[PDB]
Design a protein around this ligand. Structure first.
Ligand SMILES: CC(=O)N[C@H]1[C@@H](OC[C@H](N)C(=O)O)O[C@H](CO)[C@H](O)[C@@H]1O[C@@H]1O[C@H](CO)[C@H](O)[C@H](O)[C@H]1O
Ligand code: ZN
Length: 884
C-alpha cells in the first residue's frame, strides 16, 4: 500500500505502524489548518461587517473558550487576549456562548453590542448573519429568566415570540422552535449529550453564563455540549477584559482565524525552514547542565510547541482516544505526523550541527498520544533503551496484581511494562476511595540534556502524562517508547490495597520484597530475570524505597562494588542502606521489633513507641538510576536521581534518603541545618560499616577540629552565644560549614554512649529523639504533653523550618534534656544555639542537675574509640590530638 493509503487508514484507526512519510502528513495538515482558517474568517467577517465590536462583560463574567478547534472558534477576544464569547459549528449545528447575560445589558452597558448581536442571532436562526429573522420567530428560553431574555432580543431590533415550550427537554418543541436560549438554571438528563444532540439536529442554541465570576457545572456541561469550555477559576474578575470601540474588522477576523492555530509552524515543517542562526553563545551552564532560556527567539518557539503538547495531553490526561472522538482531524494529523517523524529519528543530535533534525524532533517529542488501540514504536531509543526493550515479549493473557499504597498520595510501581508500539489494556478494581491514574516512566525533564553539546540522545518527555482511570473501566494504551508502568494515587488510606488487571504488558526484572516475610523466592526470581537479560530497565521495591533503574548501571555497580556478587548487593541494599536508615528513625517496621535498649527506654519513659498511628513507615521515596539526572550527575527530589549506579554503602544514596527523613523540630536554626540534619543517616551507615565490614568510608566528613577552633574563638566574645553563632550558623550558604555543623550532631552520640556506658548504644539517642518528635508532632497534646517533657505548654509547639525560628532549637534542647535527664543549656550556649523563653522555663521545670558545657573531640569520623572528652565549663582546653 502507498504512504497515502496508510495515512488515510490511520486517520480512522490511529495505526501509524507503516506511516513513515512525515512530509506527506505535513502537507495534509497544511491544508486542514488552512480550511479551518478560511471557514472561520469568512464567518467572522460576515458577522462583524463594519459594526462596532464594543463588548464589556465586566469583572462579573467568565471566559468561554473553544475546546474542539476544528469546529469551534472565538467571537469576542478582549484586548488582553481573553476569549469572552465563542461560536460553535459542532456536529454541523450553530451555537454561540457568552460569559455573562448579555441579553440583560442591551439597553445599558452593552447598548453598542446590539447591532452585532442582531447579526449573530440572524446567523443562529438562518445560517446567514445578513438574513432577517421572520416576525414572531419562536424562541424557547430555558434556565434563565424568559421575559428579560425576550426583551433583550427585542432591544436588539428583533421580533421574537415566546415558543412557550422547553426545547432542551421536549423534542417536539425543539423541532418547531427557531432558537433556544440556555442559562445555568436548566434541568435535563445527560445535559452535555442532550445539548449535542439538539445542536446536531439543527436547533440553534444561544448560551449565557448566569453566575458572574463563579464557575457552573451546569454551564460547563452545556458548553461541552457545544464543543466549548468554561475558563479558569476567577473568570474576568482580575483582568476585566473587553473589546474596545476601536477594534477593527480586520484585526478580530485575523485573531479569530489564528487562535489556537500555528500555520507558521506547519509551514516551517513543510519547507524544512528551520532556524540556522540561533545564538547559542547565550546558553549557560550550571553544574554540567546546559540551558538556553536567553537565546533570542528560543522561548517563543518552545512556548508555541507547549501549546500543541498541552492540547494533546488534555486528551491523554482524561484517557480519551483521539481517533474515537469526532471533529479532531487537525490533532489527529499532528499526532500521525509526530509518529512518522519518530520512524526516522536518529541520535545523537546537536543544536548547532543538526539544526533541521534537532528542531523538528523537538516539536515531534512534544506530541505523543498514548490512548489508542494501535500505533507505532519509535525506531531508535538512543540513551534511554535499545533492542532488548523493543523485543520484550508481552502477556497475551490477562494478569492480576495486588498493590499496597503506603501513604495517602503518590505513585508506586505496578511491576509491568508497556512494550514499544504494542497495545496494552489496563483497569483497576477494589480501590475503595482512592483516586487513580496510570502513567509511564519516572524520568524528570532535565534528564534529557538536549542543550548539552551532542546530547539530544533520547526523547524529551519519557515520562507520560498521568492518565486518569475509573473504577472498573478499561483503558487501551500504546507507547512509542515502552515504559515502566506506575499507579498514581491520591485520597487513599495508608495500608490499603488496589487490584490491577493488565493484558498485553511485558515483565521487566522486578524485585518485590514482601514486608516482614521471607523473600527468598522473590530474590532468586529476580536474579533469574536479570540473568535472562531481556530488559533495558528494572525496578526494585523494598520497604518505603522504590528504585527505577537502567539495567546496565545496576550491573556496573554489582561488578565494581560487589565483584558480581548479586546476593550480597541485594542483602546490603535491604539491610545496610534501607533498613539502616528507617531503623535509625524509629519507624514501625513489620515483623521487626525495636532493640532492647530502645524498648526499655520507651518503657521507662512510658511512651508509645510502636503504634502505626504515630510511627508508620512514611510515603515511598523513589530513586532513579540512569545515564542522566535532572541536575548535575545527581539531583535531590522524589525521585532523587543518580548517574553513577547504585551502591548500598554509598554516601549519596543515604544523604538523599536522609532528606526525605528530615523533620523541622530536629534542625538547628532551620535551613542552616538543611544539609546537616540529614547527615545522621550516612554517618550512621559508615560507622556501622567500619565495625561490621572494615571499609573506612568518608572518614573526614565530621570536622571536630575546626568546629572547636570556631567555638573557642566565638566564646571569648562579650556575648559568647552570639560569638559562636556568628562563626558557625550565621553563614546562609547552602553547604556552608557543613563538616563543622555536623560535629554538633555527633556530640550527642558520644554523650549517650558514655551515659549508657556502651559504645554500641550511642546512636540510639537520635532514634529516641525521632520517636519523641513524632509524639510531639501528632499525639493528642493535652493527653501526652506531660510524658514528653512539655507540661508547661498550653499548645503544641510550632514546626517552622525558618532560620530565624527557635522551633528546632527549642525541641532539641527539650528532647535532649528530657532524655538525658540533665539541663543541657550550657552545651547549647557553647554551640551558639539560642532558645525561646518558654523552652528555657520548661527545662528549669524538669529540675535536673545542670550538665556543664562539654565537647567531644576526635581526629576521625567513623572510629569512636579515640574520642576524647573536654570539660569546657572552666575555660577552653588545648585541642587534644597532635598536628600536623
Ligand atoms: C553535603 C554533602 O554531604 N554533599 C555530598 C552529596 O551531595 C548531593 C548533591 N550532589 C548535592 O546536593 O550537591 O552527595 C554527593 C554525591 O554522592 C557528594 O558526596 C557530596 O559531597 C561533595 O562531593 C563533591 C564531589 O562531587 C565535592 O567534593 C564536595 O566538596 C563534597 O562536599
Ligand atoms: Zn543534600
Amino acid at each position: 500500500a502507498t504512504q497515502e493509503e496508510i495515512l488515510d487508514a490511520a486517520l480512522v484507526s490511529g495505526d501509524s505502524s507503516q506511516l513513515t512519510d512525515s512530509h506527506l502528513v505535513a502537507l495534509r495538515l497544511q491544508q486542514q489548518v488552512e480550511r479551518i482558517r478560511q471557514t472561520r474568517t469568512q464567518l467572522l467577517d460576515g458577522l462583524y461587517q463594519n459594526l462596532s465590536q464594543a463588548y464589556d462583560p465586566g469583572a462579573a463574567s467568565m471566559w468561554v473558550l473553544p475546546a474542539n478547534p476544528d469546529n469551534t472558534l472565538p467571537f469576542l477576544i478582549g484586548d488582553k487576549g481573553r476569549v469572552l464569547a465563542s461560536l460553535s459549528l459542532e456536529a454541523g449545528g450553530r451555537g454561540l456562548a457568552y460569559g455573562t447575560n448579555v441579553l440583560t445589558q442591551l439597553s445599558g452597558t452593552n447598548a453598542a453590542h446590539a447591532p452585532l448581536l442582531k447579526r449573530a442571532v440572524q446567523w443562529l436562526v438562518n445560517g446567514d448573519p445578513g438574513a432577517a429573522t421572520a416576525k414572531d420567530f419562536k424562541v424557547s428560553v430555558v434556565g434563565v429568566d424568559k421575559t428579560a431574555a425576550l426583551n433583550g432580543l427585542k432591544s436588539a431590533g428583533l421580533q421574537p415570540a415566546d415558543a412557550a415550550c422547553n426545547a432542551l427537554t421536549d423534542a417536539s418543541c425543539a423541532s418547531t422552535s427557531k432558537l433556544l436560549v440556555l442559562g445555568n438554571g436548566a434541568s435535563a438528563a445527560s445535559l452535555s449529550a442532550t445539548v449535542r444532540a439538539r445542536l446536531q439536529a439543527g436547533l440553534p442554541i444561544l448560551f449565557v453564563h448566569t453566575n458572574g465570576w463563579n464557575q457552573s457545572s451546569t454551564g460547563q456541561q452545556i458548553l461541552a455540549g457545544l464543543g466549548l469550555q468554561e475558563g479558569p477559576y476567577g473568570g474576568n474578575y482580575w483582568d476585566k477584559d473587553r473589546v474596545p470601540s476601536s477594534r477593527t474588522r480586520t484585526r478580530s477576523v485575523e485573531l479569530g482565524g489564528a487562535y489556537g492555530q500555528d500555520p507558521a509552524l506547519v509551514q516551517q515543517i513543510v519547507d524544512g525552514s528551520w532556524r540556522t542562526d540561533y545564538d547559542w553563545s547565550k546558553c549557560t551552564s550550571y553544574v554540567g547542565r546546559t540551558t538556553c532560556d536567553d537565546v533570542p527567539g528560543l522561548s517563543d518557539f518552545s512556548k508555541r510547541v507547549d501549546v500543541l503538547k498541552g492540547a494533546l495531553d488534555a486528551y491523554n490526561q482524561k484517557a480519551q482516544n483521539l481517533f474515537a472522538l469526532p471533529g479532531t482531524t487537525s490533532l489527529r494529523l499532528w499526532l500521525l505526523w509526530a509518529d512518522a517523524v519518530r520512524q526516522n529519528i536518529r541520535y545523537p543530535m546537536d543544536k548547532a550541527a543538526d539544526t533541521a533534525r534537532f528542531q523538528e524532533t523537538f516539536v515531534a517529542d512534544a506530541i505523543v498520544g498514548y490512548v489508542r488501540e494501535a500505533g507505532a514504536a519509535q525506531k531508535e531509543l538512543g540513551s534511554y533503551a535499545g533492542q532488548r526493550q523493543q523485543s520484550m515479549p508481552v502477556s497475551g493473557s490477562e494478569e492480576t496484581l495486588t498493590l499496597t499504597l503506603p501513604s495517602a498520595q503518590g505513585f508506586t510501581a505496578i511491576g509491568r511494562m508497556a512494550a514499544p508500539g504494542k497495545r496494552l489494556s489496563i483497569r483497576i478494581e477494589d480501590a475503595g476511595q482512592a483516586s487513580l491514574a496510570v502513567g509511564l516512566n519516572t524520568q524528570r525533564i532535565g534528564s534529557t540534556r538536549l542543550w548539552n553539546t551532542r546530547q539530544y540522545d533520547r526523547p524529551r518527555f519519557l515520562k507520560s502524562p498521568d492518565i486518569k482511570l475509573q473504577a472498573n473501566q478499561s483503558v487501551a494504551l500504546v507507547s512509542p517508547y515502552g515504559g515502566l508502568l506506575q499507579l498514581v494515587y491520591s485520597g487513599a488510606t495508608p495500608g490499603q490495597t488496589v487490584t490491577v488487571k493488565v493484558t498485553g504488558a511485558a515483565s521487566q526484572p522486578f524485585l518485590d520484597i514482601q514486608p516482614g516475610e521471607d523473600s527468598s523466592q522473590a530474590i532468586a526470581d529476580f536474579i533469574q530475570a536479570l540473568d535472562a537479560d531481556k530488559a533495558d530497565w528494572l525496578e526494585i521495591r523494598s520497604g518505603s524505597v522504590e528504585v527505577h533503574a537502567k539495567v546496565e548501571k545496576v550491573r556496573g555497580s554489582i561488578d565494581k562494588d560487589y565483584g558480581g556478587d548479586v546476593q550480597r548487593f541485594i542483602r546490603e541494599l535491604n539491610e545496610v542502606f534501607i533498613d539502616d536508615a528507617y531503623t535509625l528513625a524509629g519507624f514501625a517496621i513489620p515483623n521487626q521489633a525495636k532493640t532492647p535498649a530502645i524498648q526499655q527506654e520507651c518503657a521507662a519513659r512510658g511512651w508509645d513507641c510502636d503504634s502505626e498511628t504515630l510511627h508508620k513507615l512514611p510515603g515511598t521515596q523513589h530513586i532513579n538510576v540512569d545515564q542522566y539526572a535532572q541536575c548535575g550527575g545527581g539531583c535531590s527530589g522524589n525521585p532523587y536521581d543518580q548517574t553513577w549506579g547504585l551502591n548500598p554503602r554509598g554516601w549519596g544514596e543515604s544523604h538523599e534518603l536522609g532528606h526525605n527523613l528530615q523533620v523541622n523540630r530536629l534542625k538547628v536554626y532551620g535551613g542552616r541545618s538543611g544539609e546537616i540534619s540529614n547527615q545522621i543517616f550516612p554517618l550512621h551507615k559508615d560507622w556501622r560499616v567500619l565495625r561490621e565490614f572494615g571499609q573506612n568510608l568518608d572518614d573526614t566528613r565530621v570536622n571536630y577540629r575546626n568546629a572547636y577552633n570556631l567555638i573557642v574563638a566565638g566564646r571569648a566574645e562579650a556575648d559568647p552565644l552570639a560569638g559562636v553563632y556568628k562563626r558557625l550558623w550565621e553563614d546562609p550558604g547552602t553547604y556552608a560549614l557543613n563538616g563543622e555543623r555536623m560535629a554538633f550532631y555527633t556530640q550527642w552520640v558520644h554523650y549517650w554512649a558514655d551515659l549508657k556506658n556502651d559504645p554500641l548504644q550511642g546512636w540510639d539517642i537520635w532514634t529516641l529523639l525521632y520517636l519523641h518528635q513524632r509524639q510531639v508532632d501528632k499525639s493528642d497534646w493535652d493527653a501526652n504533653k506531660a510524658a514528653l517533657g512539655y507540661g508547661t505548654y498550653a499548645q503544641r509547639p510550632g514546626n517552622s523550618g525558618d532560620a530565624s525560628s527557635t522551633d528546632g532549637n527549642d525541641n532539641l534542647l527539650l528532647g535532649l534534656s528530657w532524655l538525658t535527664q540533665r539541663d543541657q543549656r550550657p552545651t547549647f550556649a557553647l554551640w551558639g544555639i539560642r532558645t525561646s523563653a518558654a523552652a528555657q522555663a520548661q527545662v528549669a521545670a524538669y529540675g535536673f542537675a545542670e550538665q556543664p558545657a562539654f565537647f567531644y573531640a576526635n581526629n576521625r569520623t567513623n572510629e569512636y574509640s579515640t574520642v576524647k572528652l573536654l570539660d569546657m565549663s572552666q575555660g577552653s582546653p588545648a585541642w587534644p590530638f597532635p598536628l600536623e
